């Protein structure tokens, strides 16, 4: 009853493939994109989908645009399989997989130099499908699966075959949904990523903490800090490399103990930046003469 | 020169029927052959639109996505005189995963049959009908061969249960397992969303080397 | 793969009343080759054994 839309959301970028990359008739399927609302991680429809149980597309017309010149040529056929379990991948003939496409109602073929659309065929009854990740049966959570089949070798302007896998366009969705039963859906549909890696500073005074201010990060978002160092001869001089990193705001202690009797490379710092995309932490070394660099990785959730 | 072949956005629902099809024959059995209560099940026929290979309705079922039996009455025809006697009970259970084959009581399997709605009890030398009971809600079911779950693709299962020993004209027990008649369906369907349904494609290949 | 071949084996005979095959290219105006397209009505006339 929570009807939202109509809006626009970018599904994926479609990558047309060369003639040598096509071997079996199953290899003509460029994209096999499930059109569940919880299947486009990072977009606006998927972020909303994790806050209701059920949904139903009232109008899901998928709008393809080219990203390619008009001087190269190839031909696509594109449809939405309403059954999420009818799999065209086990068809051993190359023409039968594209007759499988145009036979589905609501299908469309086009040159890939122009912008065409494929609408989603509504059911005859009133069935809602579930959001979230696909647990056991696909027929509960997927309303359709978008396919794009390459039917033509990718030629160029110069009369030659393209030898490289070429990104050839983009897929956008013009969507209009219902929803029901507001909730949270326990599996998070986000993905984490090592944002950047930057080394610890080299303090001058042994056993005195000088504060390292790092910049360049996004404002007012929470980060995670784990140490990582590569090819450092800590025994090139006397002393033991003992580091202790604490935030002045967050929580956690990164400890680097390169004593070869008891080794402790452990700990993690949870800290969030200020309004200016900066944060600071107390870096201290027991033996300041040991100038071997040690880094850390900034973990962040991107979507 | 740009050209396209976009099919329209329409969903044609093709109401086929009424036509009549053959399901199976039915083998009545002797008292010597009945050991477990699950031996009293004579036929177990799924009533999907894609479940009768040979009929035209199963051929045509894999050229649409979904179906729904609007009217489905199965009409038992005997092929036996009035001189042998055994009592059947015929019903169409609507849940395709309720199975009576794991019941340890012989009287409970025949109270399982007469208590289903739409069941019809008869001596097997007499032609009787059994109507399918449709759902209250409007549910369609997927065509084609069965996937992971029968509850997406089967609307019912026809059963015939034997409740009495197969007796002769002289009141004595028949000592052989005896085929006794046929089953014909009188159907009426919808079909929505035409699709070639990729398991329908005839193709010989090697799947997997184990 | 087409539905017409699926539905064709549920009747005995057929006859094409109207059958027009419509070539669609997928190529720009920068390469050129000349085709000729026809529908021979005899299914046993084969041009594949012509030496000219």
């Amino acid at each position: 009853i929570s009807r939202l839309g109509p809006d626009s959301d970018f599904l994926t970028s479609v990558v047309a493939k060369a003639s040598t990359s096509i071997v079996t008739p199953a290899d003509r399927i460029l994209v096999k994109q499930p059109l569940s609302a919880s299947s486009f991680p990072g977009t606006r429809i998927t972020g909303l989908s994790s806050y209701w149980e059920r949904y139903k597309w009232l109008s899901a017309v998928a709008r393809y645009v080219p990203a390619v010149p008009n001087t190269v040529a190839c031909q696509f056929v594109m449809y939405i399989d309403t059954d999420p379990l009818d799999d065209p991948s086990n068809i051993s003939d190359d023409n039968q997989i594209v007759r499988q496409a145009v036979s589905q109602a609501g299908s469309n073929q086009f040159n890939f130099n122009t912008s065409k659309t494929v609408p989603l065929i509504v059911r005859a009854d009133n069935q809602y499908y579930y959001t979230g990740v696909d647990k056991q049966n696909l027929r509960f959570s997927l309303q359709g699966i978008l396919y794009i089949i390459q039917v033509t070798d990718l030629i160029n302007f110069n009369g030659e075959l393209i030898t490289q896998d070429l990104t050839c366009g983009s897929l956008f969705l013009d969507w209009l949904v219902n929803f029901s039963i507001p909730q949270i859906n326990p599996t998070s549909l986000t993905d984490v990523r090592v944002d950047k890696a930057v080394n610890f500073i080299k303090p001058e005074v042994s056993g005195v903490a000088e504060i390292q201010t790092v910049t360049g990060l996004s404002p007012s978002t929470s980060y995670l800090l784990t140490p990582a160092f590569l090819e450092q001869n800590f025994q090139s001089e006397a002393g033991i490399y003992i580091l202790s990193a604490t935030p002045v705001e967050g929580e956690g202690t990164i400890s680097i103990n390169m004593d070869p009797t008891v080794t402790t490379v452990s700990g993690f710092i949870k800290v969030k930046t200020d309004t200016f995309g900066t944060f600071d932490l107390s870096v201290v070394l027991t033996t300041a003469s040991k100038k071997q660099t040690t880094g850390f990785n900034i973990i962040a959730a991107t979507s | 020169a740009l050209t396209s072949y976009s099919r329209p956005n329409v969903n044609k629902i093709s109401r086929l029927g009424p036509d009549s099809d053959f399901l199976t024959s039915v083998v009545a059995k002797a008292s010597t052959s009945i050991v477990t209560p699950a031996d009293r099940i004579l036929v177990k026929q799924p009533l999907s639109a894609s479940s009768f290979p040979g009929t035209r309705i199963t051929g045509l079922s894999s050229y649409w996505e979904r179906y729904k039996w609007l009217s489905a009455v199965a009409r038992y025809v005997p092929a036996v005189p009035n001189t042998v006697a055994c009592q059947f009970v015929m019903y169409i259970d609507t849940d395709p995963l309720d199975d009576p084959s794991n019941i340890s009581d012989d009287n409970q399997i025949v109270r399982q049959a007469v208590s289903q709605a739409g069941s019809n009890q008869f001596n097997f030398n007499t032609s009787k009908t059994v109507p399918l009971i449709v759902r209250a809600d409007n549910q369609y079911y997927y065509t084609g061969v069965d996937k992971q779950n029968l509850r997406f693709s089967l609307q019912g299962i026809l059963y015939i249960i034997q409740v009495t020993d197969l007796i002769n004209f002289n009141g004595e027990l028949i000592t052989q397992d005896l085929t006794c008649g046929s089953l014909f369906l009188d159907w009426l369907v919808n079909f929505s969303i035409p699709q070639i349904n990729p398991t329908s494609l005839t193709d010989v290949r090697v799947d997997k080397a184990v | 793969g087409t539905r017409i071949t699926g539905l064709s084996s549920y009747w005995e005979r057929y006859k094409w009343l109207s059958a027009v095959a419509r070539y669609v290219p997928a190529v720009p105006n920068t390469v050129a080759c000349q085709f000729v397209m026809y529908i021979d009505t005899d299914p046993l006339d084969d041009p594949s054994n012509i030496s000219d």
């Binding site: 509504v122 005859a124 | 329409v10 629902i13 093709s14 029927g17 099809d21 035209r56 014909f184 929505s192 | -």
Partner: peptide, 23 residues
């Protein structure tokens, strides 16, 4: 949209009943 075409690709099978006397 949705449309409901009365498909005409079927055929009937009407049932007739009889029954022989003893003589």
């Amino acid at each position: 949209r949705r449309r409901v075409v009365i498909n005409q690709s079927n055929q009937s099978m009407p049932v007739t009943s009889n029954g022989a006397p003893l003589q």
